[PDB]
Design a protein around this ligand. Structure first.
Ligand SMILES: *[C@@H]1O[C@H](CO)[C@@H](O[C@@H]2O[C@H](CO)[C@@H](O)[C@H](O)[C@H]2NC(C)=O)[C@H](O)[C@H]1NC(C)=O
Lengths: 49, 49
């Protein structure tokens, strides 16, 4: 009778994240990003500020 | 006590567009490759766009 559906992963996503885990991912916003392969970027563009 | 003749020069440096310049011949304008440059005494190295 216990229902662990919201904390176990679901296969429909392309990751093994559950319903609480991607709620937790979309609340930690970043003051600066990490790596988006921004090295092709920042060269020759105008949106490099 | 013999008289001396004095000239005093005075100028700003790298503030605004310039009028008095130096005896140097220009070149063309190459883009999108790492070159040195010289814009009115301002040196540097990089890529123009
Ligand atoms: C465990 O809880 C979840 C969430 O309440 C249940 O998922 C729901 O299932 C019904 C099917 O009758 C759907 O209509 C709802 O849309 C589902 N909710 C969500 C948020 O997806 C799940 O059925 C429960 N497990 C059991 C065995 O009852």
């Amino acid at each position: 009778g216990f229902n662990f559906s919201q904390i176990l992963p679901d296969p429909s996503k392309p990751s093994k994240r559950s319903f609480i885990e991607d709620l937790l991912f979309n609340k930690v916003t970043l003051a600066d990003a990490g790596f988006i392969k921004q090295y092709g970027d920042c060269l020759g563009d105008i949106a490099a500020r | 006590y013999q008289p001396y003749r004095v000239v005093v020069l005075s100028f700003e440096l790298l503030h605004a567009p310039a009028t008095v310049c130096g005896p140097k011949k220009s070149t063309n304008l190459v883009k999108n490759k790492c070159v040195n440059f010289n814009f009115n005494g301002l040196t540097g190295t990089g890529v123009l766009t």
